[PDB]
Ligand binder design. Structure first.
Ligand SMILES: CCCCOc1ccc(C[C@H](CC)C(=O)O)cc1CNC(=O)c1ccc(C(F)(F)F)cc1F
Ligand SMILES: CCCCOc1ccc(C[C@H](CC)C(=O)O)cc1CNC(=O)c1ccc(C(F)(F)F)cc1F
Ligand SMILES: CCCCCCCO[C@@H]1O[C@H](CO)[C@@H](O)[C@H](O)[C@H]1O
Ligand SMILES: CCCCCCCO[C@@H]1O[C@H](CO)[C@@H](O)[C@H](O)[C@H]1O
Lengths: 262, 259
């Protein structure tokens, strides 16, 4: 099959773009949470302040809850870069005019960020600083209200998502499909993207068949997860607008600013 | 430091197909290539279109207007590859790479036009033909109004006699201009811009020894270039506002918007 041909490869390429650009994979991550060092479990002020100073590891320290909030922003900023590189590592993506690539990453980065978060997280916590730390959900659950409410949803979806058992090759394609989404606000060359999206999804469709043989309704579930990811980022942007209103004191990083404006 | 000037010169040479080099030679009636077929009426332009040298052909003046667009579309394409070809530039987050390109391209397109023009006409289609300023003016006012201001600038700029090496450094100083509206990270840009300008200067003393007052002149041409585009946009908007029948490429739409 002429299609099945250029696709298995197109799949591999993206997978080779994922592996070259993300500092953390579910492969590496999953090992840490199961089978070197025992990541310093952060669960309170001491562990936090400890991990901070030098044990494990930025705006003027104001408070633990705001400090964590900031530590969640940096994460996003560093991820958006790897996601630009990953996007660029797709020849049909790079061809697009610079402005179209911005609109994609702008409205796409968080959908992709909430899917990759699931990789470095288990029902009890997430991996920080190249998996050398482990922030406990219980600690994160105890942060100040305004900021403690954005942390939970991310967890609820991460577990319901991680049950599909997707490895790094599925995610390579999954993330590409999230970035190249024609239905993006103010996109220009829409048909070109919609077209690039179909190749990715078809490649993703073939790939799930080989990689997850006797599996079930996996593909349609991921399209749903993609839809759930659209809604999660929405429920998120909303909480962020309230943080910029009520938390008159806490700051927002430049890149997170321009991402939310309109 | 020259590692910067060599880097930008090789970024400029590799990226833009028509350097002042090839172009300037092809106008000095030289021998290493071939004669350029002149275009002055509708018969020559059609011939060019035929073989010797895109929306539904509406009219004379509009067909040219369209050719102007598809020309700045491939210039913006080489200009993007160029800008990225400056490592210090690429580091920047995609969003700012665009803002610099959104307000810089036209300033940089008009400077390079002068590179391929002269009081009589300009080279079109890879120096394969030669459109005349005469034929250019003759087009209906809602089009001839944008073409001439560029010719006046063109000649009143080639009088400085730069060479590809300078331009490489001129176009870079225009692209990276932290005075662009909505730049997320102004300081990181104002820093790169300074390096290029300092780099430029050192290169102008060596490359244009006797050039009395060169470097300060260019910065002035830089300002004039913002002046030209600013006025160029005004007209374009006015056309988009009048010639409803006339289609404007989506990319030229995004650039102008808000200007
Ligand atoms: C895995 C589920 C956890 C939810 O994680 C989230 C949720 C929302 C966001 C939103 C960010 C900024 C608030 C964004 O909107 O871009 C970031 C993280 C990512 N946060 C971190 O990576 C993180 C990083 C450092 C710390 C620590 F150690 F400082 F406590 C705690 C953290 F949750
Ligand atoms: C060098 C001085 C000439 C002035 O050229 C100009 C002036 C303004 C613009 C503005 C363009 C679109 C209107 C833009 O704003 O991006 C483009 C050109 C570029 N035009 C062309 O490249 C061009 C291309 C083809 C033809 C023709 F006659 F052969 F069809 C005529 C042309 F001026
Ligand atoms: C790779 C990360 C990219 C993050 C991009 C964030 C883009 O924000 C948008 O940048 C545009 C210019 O490019 C502006 O015109 C929009 O008003 C602004 O909302
Ligand atoms: C390399 C050529 C780049 C041309 C870029 C033209 C960009 O236009 C701007 O694109 C932004 C999204 O990216 C929008 O948010 C702004 O409203 C719009 O004005």
């Amino acid at each position: 099959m002429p299609q099945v041909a250029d696709l298995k490869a197109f799949s591999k390429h993206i997978y080779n773009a994922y592996l070259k650009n993300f500092n953390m994979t579910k492969k590496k991550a999953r090992s840490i949470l199961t089978g070197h060092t025992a990541p310093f479990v952060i669960h309170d002020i001491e562990t936090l302040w400890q991990a901070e100073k030098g044990l494990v590891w930025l705006p003027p320290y104001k408070e633990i809850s705001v400090h964590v909030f900031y530590r969640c922003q940096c994460t996003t900023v560093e991820t958006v870069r790897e996601l630009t590189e990953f996007a660029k590592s797709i020849p049909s993506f790079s061809s697009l005019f610079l402005n179209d690539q911005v609109t994609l990453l702008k409205y796409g980065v968080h959908e992709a960020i909430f899917a990759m978060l699931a990789s470095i997280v288990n029902k009890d916590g997430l991996l920080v600083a190249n998996g050398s730390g482990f922030v406990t959900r219980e600690f994160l659950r105890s942060l100040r209200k305004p900021f403690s409410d954005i942390i939970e949803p991310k967890f609820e979806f991460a577990v319901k998502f991680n049950a599909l058992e997707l490895d790094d090759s599925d995610l390579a394609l999954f993330i590409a499909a999230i970035i190249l989404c024609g239905d993006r606000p103010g996109l220009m060359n829409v048909p070109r993207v919609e077209a690039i999206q179909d190749t990715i999804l078809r490649a993703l469709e073939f790939h799930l068949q080989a990689n997850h043989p006797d599996a079930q309704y996996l593909f349609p579930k991921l399209l749903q997860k993609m839809a759930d990811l659209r809604q999660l980022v929405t429920e998120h942007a909303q909480m962020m607008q309230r943080i910029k209103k009520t938390e008159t004191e806490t700051s927002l990083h430049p890149l997170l600013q321009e991402i939310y404006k309109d």
